[PDB]
């Protein structure tokens, strides 16, 4: 187990807020789950455990993976399918607003300054 190793290093290093050189490339899975672990996606983790005292040490450990896991935060966003055309057009749009806002901003400013001046 070097993937769980991988996994665990990913989580902890994520649980931090370090999210810088979080060892995604440490294993084949940490990369497949890269999205899942700290990005665009809604992740649920069903940590499974045994109720027996003999498994207590492991139970403890598992719980703590859950514990630390619960504090990771993903930035979820529906996935949109568009051609480059669409993306260039909508970008143009979101550039017309840019220009637009500018004026309104330079509007207020003038008044306040001007209004005041």
């Amino acid at each position: 187990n070097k993937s769980l190793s991988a996994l665990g290093n990913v989580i902890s290093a994520l649980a931090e807020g370090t999210k810088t050189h979080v060892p995604y490339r440490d294993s084949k899975m940490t990369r497949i789950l890269q999205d899942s672990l700290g990005g665009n996606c809604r992740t649920t983790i069903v940590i499974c455990c045994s109720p027996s005292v003999f498994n207590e040490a492991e139970t403890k450990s598992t719980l703590m993976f859950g514990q630390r896991a619960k504090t990771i935060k993903n930035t979820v966003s529906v996935n949109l399918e568009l051609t480059a055309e669409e993306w260039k057009k909508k970008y143009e749009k979101e550039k017309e607003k840019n220009k637009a806002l500018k004026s309104v901003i330079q509007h207020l400013e003038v008044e306040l300054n001007r209004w005041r001046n």
Binding site: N1, L4, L33, T44, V46, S61, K70, N74, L82
Partner: protein, 238 residues
């Protein structure tokens, strides 16, 4: 638009004492308080999104852990459900269960039925394309379960820098039944080259991947979700 933060949810599922354990007269250590707290003997309490005690059925664990991910996935969001635990703890009963048993099937089987239950109800102007995948990872090696001849699959990075298993097999499904078949098939193929499965699983991650793509033929808006249902390997230490 504006994407939102969202803590990763965590479910604590506890399994019943099993025949050996009972016989050895072991006692149940966990003490459950409410729906999301669990105490271990006399120590600080553990609090999770939900704490699923042993009597919580397969339906319940689906409804509290996966029912909402299918809904988000069909809408353009990427859902990922995974089982983490020590070997023999409960991951596989969770994720797969008695695969063709109505009472005891697990997440995968259930997500197989939900997705198409949802879809079939949608308006005909909504055109879905569900394509499944099924690989396993052993000693850092990815083996397509649907093409056992593929045994050192690589992970490349797509159009927008997103990790992914390249060259794996992609099956277009159109029913809960064609997905089951893909499950059945990879379940057998897993044997190919395996002397001991018990030992195998105990050390291998089984990764199921429902890849959804929806299109509105009216408004033309297109969206795609990646559903990752992972059944990891024992987490037992050194």
């Amino acid at each position: 638009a504006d994407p939102a933060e969202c803590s990763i949810k965590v479910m604590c599922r506890f399994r019943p004492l099993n025949e050996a354990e009972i016989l050895r007269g072991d006692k149940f250590i966990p003490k459950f308080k409410g729906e999301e707290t669990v105490v271990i003997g006399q120590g600080k309490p553990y609090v999770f999104d939900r704490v699923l005690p042993p009597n919580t059925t397969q339906e319940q664990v689906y409804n509290a852990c996966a029912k909402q991910i299918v809904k988000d996935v069909l809408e353009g969001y990427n859902g990922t459900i995974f089982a983490y635990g020590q070997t023999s703890s409960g991951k596989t009963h969770t994720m797969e269960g008695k695969l063709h048993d109505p009472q005891l099937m697990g997440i995968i089987p259930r997500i197989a039925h939900d997705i198409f239950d949802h879809i079939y109800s949608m308006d005909e102007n909504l055109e879905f394309h569900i394509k499944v995948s099924y690989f396993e990872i052993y000693l850092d090696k990815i083996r397509d379960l649907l093409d056992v001849s593929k045994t050192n699959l690589a992970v490349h990075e797509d159009k927008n820098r997103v990790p992914y298993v390249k060259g794996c097999t992609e099956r277009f499904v159109s029913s809960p039944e064609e997905v089951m078949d893909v499950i059945d098939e990879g379940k057998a193929n897993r044997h190919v080259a395996v002397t001991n499965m018990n030992e195998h699983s105990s050390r291998s991650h089984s990764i199921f991947l429902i890849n959804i793509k929806q299109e509105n033929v009216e408004t033309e808006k297109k969206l795609s979700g990646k559903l990752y249902l992972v059944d990891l390997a024992g987490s037992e230490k050194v």
